[PDB]
Amino acid sequence: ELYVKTTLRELVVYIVFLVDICLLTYGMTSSSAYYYTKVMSELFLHTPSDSGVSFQTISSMSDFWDFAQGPLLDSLYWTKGSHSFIYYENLLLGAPRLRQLRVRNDSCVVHEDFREDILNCYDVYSPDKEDQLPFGPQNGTAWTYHSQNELGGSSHWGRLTSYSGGGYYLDLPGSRQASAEALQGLQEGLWLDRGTRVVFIDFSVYNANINLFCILRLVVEFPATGGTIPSWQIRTVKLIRYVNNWDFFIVGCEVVFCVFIFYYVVEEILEIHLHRLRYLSSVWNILDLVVILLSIVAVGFHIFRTLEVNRLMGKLLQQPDTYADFEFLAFWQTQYNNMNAVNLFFAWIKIFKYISFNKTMTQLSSTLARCAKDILGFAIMFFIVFFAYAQLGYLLFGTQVENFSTFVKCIFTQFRIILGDFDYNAIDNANRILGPVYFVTYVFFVFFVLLNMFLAIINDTYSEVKEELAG
Amino acid sequence: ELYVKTTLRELVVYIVFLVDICLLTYGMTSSSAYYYTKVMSELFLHTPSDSGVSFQTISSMSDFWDFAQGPLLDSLYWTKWYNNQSLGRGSHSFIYYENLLLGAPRLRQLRVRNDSCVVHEDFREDILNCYDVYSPDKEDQLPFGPQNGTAWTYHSQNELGGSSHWGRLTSYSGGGYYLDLPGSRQASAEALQGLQEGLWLDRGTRVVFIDFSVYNANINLFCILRLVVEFPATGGTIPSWQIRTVKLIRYVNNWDFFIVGCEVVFCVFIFYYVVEEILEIHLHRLRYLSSVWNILDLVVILLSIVAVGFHIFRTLEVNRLMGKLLQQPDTYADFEFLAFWQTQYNNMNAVNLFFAWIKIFKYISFNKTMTQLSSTLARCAKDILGFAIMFFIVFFAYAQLGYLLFGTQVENFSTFVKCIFTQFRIILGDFDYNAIDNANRILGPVYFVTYVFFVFFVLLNMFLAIINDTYSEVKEELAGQK
Amino acid sequence: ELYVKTTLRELVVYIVFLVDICLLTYGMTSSSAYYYTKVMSELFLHTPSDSGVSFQTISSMSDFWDFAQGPLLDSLYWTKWYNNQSLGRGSHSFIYYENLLLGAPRLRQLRVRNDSCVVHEDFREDILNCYDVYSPDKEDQLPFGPQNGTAWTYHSQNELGGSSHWGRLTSYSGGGYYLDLPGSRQASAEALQGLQEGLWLDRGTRVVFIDFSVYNANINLFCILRLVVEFPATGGTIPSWQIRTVKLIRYVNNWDFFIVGCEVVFCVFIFYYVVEEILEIHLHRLRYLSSVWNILDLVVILLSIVAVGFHIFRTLEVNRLMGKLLQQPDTYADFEFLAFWQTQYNNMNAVNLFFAWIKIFKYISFNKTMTQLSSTLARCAKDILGFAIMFFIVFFAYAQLGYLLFGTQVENFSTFVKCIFTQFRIILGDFDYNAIDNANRILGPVYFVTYVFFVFFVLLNMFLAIINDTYSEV
Amino acid sequence: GTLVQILFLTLLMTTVYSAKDSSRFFLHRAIWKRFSHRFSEIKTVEDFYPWANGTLLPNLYGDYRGFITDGNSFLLGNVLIRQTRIPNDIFFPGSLHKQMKSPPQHQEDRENYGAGWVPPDTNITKVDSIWHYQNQESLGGYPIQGELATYSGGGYVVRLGRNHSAATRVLQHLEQRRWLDHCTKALFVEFTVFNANVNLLCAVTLILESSGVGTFLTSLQLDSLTSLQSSERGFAWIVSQVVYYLLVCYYAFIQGCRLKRQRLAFFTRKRNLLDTSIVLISFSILGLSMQSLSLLHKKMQQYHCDRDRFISFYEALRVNSAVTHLRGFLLLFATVRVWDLLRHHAQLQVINKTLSKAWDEVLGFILIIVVLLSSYAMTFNLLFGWSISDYQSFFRSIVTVVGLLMGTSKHKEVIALYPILGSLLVLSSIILMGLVIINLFVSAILIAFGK
Ligand SMILES: *[C@@H]1O[C@H](CO)[C@@H](O)[C@H](O)[C@H]1NC(C)=O
Ligand SMILES: *[C@@H]1O[C@H](CO)[C@@H](O)[C@H](O)[C@H]1NC(C)=O
Ligand SMILES: *[C@@H]1O[C@H](CO)[C@@H](O)[C@H](O)[C@H]1NC(C)=O
Ligand SMILES: *[C@@H]1O[C@H](CO)[C@@H](O)[C@H](O)[C@H]1NC(C)=O
Ligand SMILES: *[C@@H]1O[C@H](CO)[C@@H](O)[C@H](O)[C@H]1NC(C)=O
Ligand SMILES: *[C@@H]1O[C@H](CO)[C@@H](O)[C@H](O)[C@H]1NC(C)=O
Ligand SMILES: *[C@@H]1O[C@H](CO)[C@@H](O)[C@H](O)[C@H]1NC(C)=O
Ligand SMILES: *[C@@H]1O[C@H](CO)[C@@H](O)[C@H](O)[C@H]1NC(C)=O
Ligand SMILES: *[C@@H]1O[C@H](CO)[C@@H](O)[C@H](O)[C@H]1NC(C)=O
Ligand SMILES: *[C@@H]1O[C@H](CO)[C@@H](O)[C@H](O)[C@H]1NC(C)=O
Ligand SMILES: [Ca+2]
Ligand SMILES: [Ca+2]
Ligand SMILES: [Ca+2]
């Protein structure tokens, strides 16, 4: 029935804590944060050049050089100061930076039949096999190697190799014809040659009306087989200023939240007086520690981010015309956002522990304990066949289809097939004799397993009531 | 309980055999194949001409000659960097600056005869000739055009060493009228001009193949391209393609000198399994065929010996092909046969691995995990069989109705098995109702609505009978216990 | 068990009938009938002119006269190979080099009178003309323009042997102002230029038809094309098309000389079944209409008799058409009537075959296979029959509400039937919520979420009443 | 008794159903296909002159004396271009640099100006100058609720009406003098058309809103109204309209007499609340439906008086939308009445055998659904709210989660973006729903076996 559980004090204080935690989490986001990533993602990607080369259309090296000297400069260095303002309001912080990662000349020895037609051979990228020598004119910074310690940077687990953070870089100058001449000098000399493996272009924009940084990087990968694979990453950062009244209200909510997590951690460590008895047996006494840990790491990252953004903006206003690394801050800010979302989810869940609802919910965890030992004998018997199917799909398709191109992608593709979201035509075109067979038999197996476990569940209670009525 | 039948020795030797077969089927599939096929495909059948004719956009005979001259030669022959500076390696076409071009591309065409028809009374004074649809009995084997070269004279399948091809309409033969494009781009752009000034594609044509192959040596992978254009009896084109990335040369690394030992272990393992399967036939004369696990063991052993034989076959074939290719260049090296059979061998290996993985269930056993449905069907077998045939009678009635109402407008209903799979997909909530509606806007909604209602009705009956039989039997045993 | 009902001798003579029907209706298809319509459609609808105006993207009268000259004469009159040398067949146009073009195309138009209204009493010194929506009462029958040719005078439906067309707005008539295009491409271009100069598509036009036909002799198939453009009274155009691939001449090769035996055994079977129905009527004088299978037998017999009569009709009509086509060329040979009725005959045959298939359950009867629901509804009919009626009564209200709120911006809610089918498709999980969200940002979400909660509530109540009925007292 | 009630209710549903004319749809679509051509390619403030010189002027004066495109729709009165600004306090950001910007909303700059935006010359307000904030009342306007705003009313106004030359002159004069600045907020282009083939008055408004980041969100809004006469239709509908309204007034008399023989204790009898709300709503519908036409006729007399001046029909369209909402309410009232009179004259239970309609069970179910929707909606809006559009806000996320429940919206982008978080959340949702339905099943089993 609808009745309040344990106490009327803890319920009220938890309601207060929930309102506070759901007000200090929605106060670090922006309503116009989705319209900023769409206006900046359609300006730099969907903008065709002459000959119609967007960013997502880049498919060779000549296409890369038509995109670089075309709609990349026309979008960075806008038209009608000493500083550039994209769309009359946005401010381009620092200076962009092209960065390239090469691969050594002799790393992938050729076969015996071809070693008179193909002299030297360039392997796929690997930090073991990487070129660290000057090339081209061997003159500037775009033709010599600078390690990851000089170029303060970090790995980029982007696609196929988790690329490093060093390489051959060039910081575009302030003007537009100056940077156009720089890129022309980089094209006439062969910057992109057989040894190139990846090229990053990263920069950052700041809007003033809304206080938002849009930090965007564009990666182009040149596989060992020629071609390109353009990908991108566009993120947003807040940089809350403490000048409004709402900002001081948010500071108040933050200090209240700190006091709340302290009171909850003391209330948790106090009831460990039941040293091991009934403590780590209850399930809620794991959710409490989880939300405590998450709420601690939250303020940890908050302090760190304040310090880092202060340092970065100081370095920027100290000496412009140099790359200001914002990628670290943006990446870890998105991690912080995800952690906050999960913490809010758990804090919303605990209300069920605090207040009881219809008898259905109170007996739901009693229903779950019915399939006590049937499920561990079902999980294995289902996952064995699930992974057999996953790798069968990876081996039949996976050269043609994209969703099957690797193992974990097969796992998630099958998990989506369960949810009624599939693309049967690509499967069929990949192999029109073992495609339909795979699809049909997989769906039949899933339905069979589901029906079987349902039969087991509702056959458990028959035997239960039978033995309890005749016992 | 997770008790294991089949005493632990058998279980551990099977675990070792399974890990060995897994090691030698994953250790010989490179992870850089998908992007190889992706870049080659989006280079060759996605590049527009000066008039906007990619390969997939081909829709007449006048678009073939627009693609076969503009973006087919601009893609095959690479000889300069992007900054107009000549490549180093000379007299060779390094596609994308990395992939070689083995041999010379080949164009092949198959024509159909002139008198394979009857216009039959009324058009016999307006329509003089009639060319049937393709079939090997009706096939032209006479020279046309100037009747001189190789592009104008028929060479049977055994002179070309060709093989069949399962296109989108029929399965085509291996002979035909062919032409090998020469080395340079200019010398091969004026060879495709004598084929146009003279009518190479006339009324009697039925299919044109363009075959070639590249070999990347950074990773060690061949990519064999075949581009097919079929001209139905109704006029038009149906462009299709097959791009196969394979690994035909095995040992160029240091990892492979270990899969050699893996192959040896696999061979001794299949020998042991067949010698132990002989004993269960000896002991049980005909009780051996009772269980079904022995059927699966026989299947796995047969697939294993087939996969052993194909290894020797491929070694011999690729040695011969590389010899002929490096011994007389400027000739078409037939890599398509080998690529086809290599992909078939890969598919067979995948199926065999799946069978071994699900065969793991005869060693480790659970008590009563997934017998909850088997135990409740054995009490309703003779009515399950009567339910299935009724459902299938009306299902195939609906499939025929769909194939006849639509099926000349909608593509999913174009054939019969396509109707079967389209309905099976409709069940899973994947349909295009607008196509059905526009095809026929009185019988379309009727078909859709009544089909959905019927399948809902039969799932309801299935669920009701299932949850009713168990209750019936449990209360029956409780009554009989009194 | 699977006991056979009422004999085992009748099941055999019915299985023979089933095999004969399958051979009759599957021997007259063609494996190459889909690609025919595919290639003709993508030739005539998808080909873009200069300025990039195909047929599917017509949106004005300038766009029409842009399509009717660029990519319509280029896609009709073929006289040279791709290498610019002449075809060896003179005075005829072989589309795609294989498909003969029968007769001559015909543009047709349906005008509307200049004073088919009374303008609003306030706008009378400003708007001097009202052209009402199309209906055969307010339809202009007077000459216009130069007033001399056949394109500027009204010919009734009887002078133009033709019939109605069920367009996407209404059903149009068969008269109008027509023009048969000549043979060569230059003469046709000059005729269309003369039609465009003296304004042919004025404010009073309501439809424009372009119909022609094509015969391919490699396969044996006609492809009758009709392209319709409708100019509503509110503005704009709604281009539509109907492309019908049919087999009118259907006895050519040796395989079709085999079906002329199945047709004979088919009419013999129809005679046998009608003489059996007369018998089993003579013994059950009025108890005959209590055996619903008998209604199905009567329906199948009726459909078979109609399908027998249409054969005679089509033979006579196609003979007449071929005669008129070879005696006087350069004139429109009306193949659209025959193509339409042939496709209707094919649809009727498909439905009759479906019925003859599900009529198997009249002999082969199973005991209680799919009876566990009818046995449930027969007992618990009240809270599951009346409840369903209540759900139906609560549905139509939602259909009307969706037609009220949206229905001027969204298309799926444009009419009542479209609202009904849009809701039925919402149930199956097929919907585009962004449209009704943009149409109304406050009542869109309300409509959607309350509809979803209602359907969930109804199906949950039904499932509960179904499962707690088996555990009632049995 | 009951015969007259069921007849009257069927007539009422006939009334609310028969107000259907599809000619109102196509009209909208037609206009929306002409003026919305190349409209989204406007991202700056100087990209509106080339868009209104080949996509607006040609479609507004389509080679006819008055009619918009291909005759049909007449162009009533005059076209208006309105603009709302913000005060030119960009003197503080001498270069639009990065500081504590955004003063308090920069409420609409309602002050006069001069030749350029030069300070004014006198202290009076002119009604004919492009550089004077006119009014909301003296303009006869209404707050155009855009996409992210309310746009409280008038502003700086220009008229470019009735020719093609008199519009090109105005556009050139506005382009030279730099009328559209960087200080401009939303810009509206408004006009109205009357189609006489199907008697239908439409009002069109093209909206350009200035987002925070320098750009422009472009939208198009149309409102229709059928200006037919009292009858001008079939006698059946007229006879079905008069008989329904006399039945309505008879029922009004009946309930009035029932409420005089029962003075105040009539709240409990909910069988009369519906029957009196129905009569009130029907009378309101009729009254407003004729008042809208009276207002339209008044405005048309005003038009005939002093032609060639901008005329706004916002009042009539507002009354018409009120009538539409009244019909939408009357429909659900009628269905509730029909359903609660078919529960007593033929007792058909619905929730029975599991009713539990006390104040505890229903409230508890509502609460658990609300909590389980709010939790998932909030976390989905926080995780994928920056990239995906369906989870852009909170309520949008609630509707998207309900769609996920129904299957309408398929979650494949939440699996592409976050393959391990979104997958885990979907798995949790599936497990929860499965547990719920299994618990219902086992409870229904155990209640009817344990005795
Ligand atoms: C091969 O690599 C060496 C460095 O190990 C370099 O000196 C040489 O120029 C390279 N050759 C080519 C052709 O790039
Ligand atoms: C490049 O070399 C020139 C001399 O050739 C030298 O003056 C210059 O400092 C070097 N570095 C540059 C230009 O970055
Ligand atoms: C490319 O270089 C060749 C070398 O002779 C020259 O003839 C040609 O004009 C160049 N093409 C350009 C620069 O576009
Ligand atoms: C018909 O086929 C014969 C067989 O070779 C050939 O000689 C003749 O030229 C063909 N006729 C035409 C018109 O192509
Ligand atoms: C054409 O045929 C003649 C003999 O008929 C032969 O000598 C010649 O080599 C052939 N090829 C030509 C002329 O290109
Ligand atoms: C094709 O032939 C005609 C007729 O001789 C000629 O006028 C034209 O220039 C040729 N070439 C074309 C159309 O490209
Ligand atoms: C309508 O068209 C007719 C056709 O000639 C013309 O005589 C008449 O003047 C036009 N206007 C009216 C108001 O009838
Ligand atoms: C109209 O037709 C008449 C036929 O009597 C002809 O004399 C006249 O020249 C034609 N005029 C035009 C403009 O076609
Ligand atoms: C407006 O467009 C017309 C034709 O589209 C053109 O002649 C005129 O020059 C344009 N006006 C301006 C100011 O560009
Ligand atoms: C232009 O419009 C004005 C009023 O708006 C009118 O007085 C004048 O006659 C019109 N001129 C032309 C050429 O239409
Ligand atoms: Ca606790
Ligand atoms: Ca065995
Ligand atoms: Ca009978």
Side-chain angles (χ1 to χ4, degrees), chain B residues 134-196:
Chain B
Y134 180 77
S135 33
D137 9 310
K138 320 177 165 311
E139 198 183 358
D140 209 12
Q141 307 186 6
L142 303 165
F144 67 107
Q147 313 171 17
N148 210 355
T150 50
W152 323 93
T153 36
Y154 183 84
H155 321 266
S156 65
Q157 178 180 333
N158 296 278
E159 308 182 28
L160 257 50
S163 33
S164 276
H165 181 266
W166 187 25
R168 302 212 78 82
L169 293 172
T170 311
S171 67
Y172 302 98
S173 166
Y177 306 72
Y178 76 86
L179 177 98
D180 291 335
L181 300 182
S184 32
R185 178 199 193 286
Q186 174 52 35
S188 102
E190 79 190 12
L192 294 161
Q193 195 78 20
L195 262 44
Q196 176 175 8

Side-chain angles (χ1 to χ4, degrees), chain B residues 80 83-86:
Chain B
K80 294 192 314 295
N83 68 321
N84 196 355
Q85 164 187 340
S86 99

Side-chain angles (χ1 to χ4, degrees), chain C residues 28-330:
Chain C
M28 307 318 287
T29 55
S30 207
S31 297
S32 168
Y34 161 60
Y35 284 110
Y36 204 177
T37 89
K38 188 200 181 194
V39 301
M40 299 308 276
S41 311
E42 314 189 331
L43 165 61
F44 278 99
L45 316 174
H46 295 322
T47 179
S49 180
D50 314 321
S51 326
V53 42
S54 44
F55 180 76
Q56 296 176 327
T57 82
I58 289 190
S59 159
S60 326
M61 295 172 182
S62 325
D63 281 8
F64 181 86
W65 290 121
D66 203 338
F67 154 82
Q69 308 199 234
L72 179 68
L73 317 177
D74 302 7
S75 325
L76 258 176
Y77 304 115
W78 294 50
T79 165
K80 293 189 312 298
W81 285 102
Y82 48 89
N83 74 318
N84 207 39
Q85 82 167 262
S86 146
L87 264 59
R89 334 183 211 92
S91 68
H92 283 136
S93 159
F94 275 76
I95 312 180
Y96 271 142
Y97 316 130
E98 325 245 9
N99 314 41
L100 188 69
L101 174 80
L102 306 167
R106 166 184 273 178
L107 273 73
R108 197 163 56 84
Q109 183 202 29
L110 282 153
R111 310 269 318 281
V112 148
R113 219 182 317 124
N114 204 16
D115 48 65
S116 52
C117 292
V118 274
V119 228
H120 201 238
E121 40 217 89
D122 296 303
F123 315 85
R124 277 193 200 272
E125 288 82 26
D126 303 308
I127 323 188
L128 309 172
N129 300 141
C130 187
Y131 308 88
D132 197 29
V133 308
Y134 181 76
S135 40
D137 317 300
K138 42 218 48 191
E139 171 168 321
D140 192 17
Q141 313 194 1
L142 297 168
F144 72 113
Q147 298 169 54
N148 71 344
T150 61
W152 323 92
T153 77
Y154 183 87
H155 319 262
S156 168
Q157 184 179 356
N158 292 275
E159 312 185 30
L160 263 52
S163 323
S164 320
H165 185 260
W166 182 26
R168 308 211 76 79
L169 285 186
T170 159
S171 70
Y172 304 105
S173 165
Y177 305 70
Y178 73 93
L179 169 101
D180 293 334
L181 298 181
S184 34
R185 177 192 192 285
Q186 181 59 30
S188 146
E190 296 180 351
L192 286 172
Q193 182 71 35
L195 247 56
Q196 176 184 24
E197 285 179 353
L199 307 160
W200 200 57
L201 298 184
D202 52 353
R203 240 192 291 171
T205 300
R206 289 296 180 242
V207 211
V208 185
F209 304 100
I210 311 162
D211 8 4
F212 48 104
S213 327
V214 148
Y215 178 65
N216 185 10
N218 308 342
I219 60 185
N220 182 36
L221 287 175
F222 292 72
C223 180
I224 283 101
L225 287 118
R226 160 169 279 184
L227 322 167
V228 187
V229 182
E230 333 194 29
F231 308 91
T234 72
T237 88
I238 316 171
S240 174
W241 55 85
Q242 295 209 4
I243 298 165
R244 300 186 144 105
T245 281
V246 289
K247 175 194 295 290
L248 304 192
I249 298 148
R250 53 170 48 198
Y251 294 108
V252 171
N253 53 348
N254 255 260
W255 166 257
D256 288 310
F257 290 146
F258 166 59
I259 317 294
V260 59
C262 303
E263 249 280 311
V264 189
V265 317
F266 180 84
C267 35
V268 172
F269 262 118
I270 288 316
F271 173 60
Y272 162 57
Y273 275 104
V274 71
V275 89
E276 174 199 79
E277 282 297 326
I278 281 187
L279 282 186
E280 89 181 14
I281 277 187
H282 187 266
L283 319 185
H284 298 352
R285 228 58 60 100
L286 178 153
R287 217 68 62 92
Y288 174 75
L289 310 145
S290 326
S291 186
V292 66
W293 294 118
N294 282 337
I295 301 319
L296 219 57
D297 293 11
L298 284 181
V299 151
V300 170
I301 289 180
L302 179 68
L303 295 194
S304 317
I305 290 182
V306 177
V308 164
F310 185 77
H311 256 252
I312 310 176
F313 168 63
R314 195 205 57 234
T315 290
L316 298 189
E317 176 78 0
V318 73
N319 280 149
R320 176 187 72 82
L321 267 174
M322 297 317 299
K324 188 256 295 306
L325 185 61
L326 88 86
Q327 66 135 330
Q328 51 182 178
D330 285 15

Side-chain angles (χ1 to χ4, degrees), chain A residues 137-143:
Chain A
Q138 319 177 11
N139 193 188
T141 67
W143 311 99

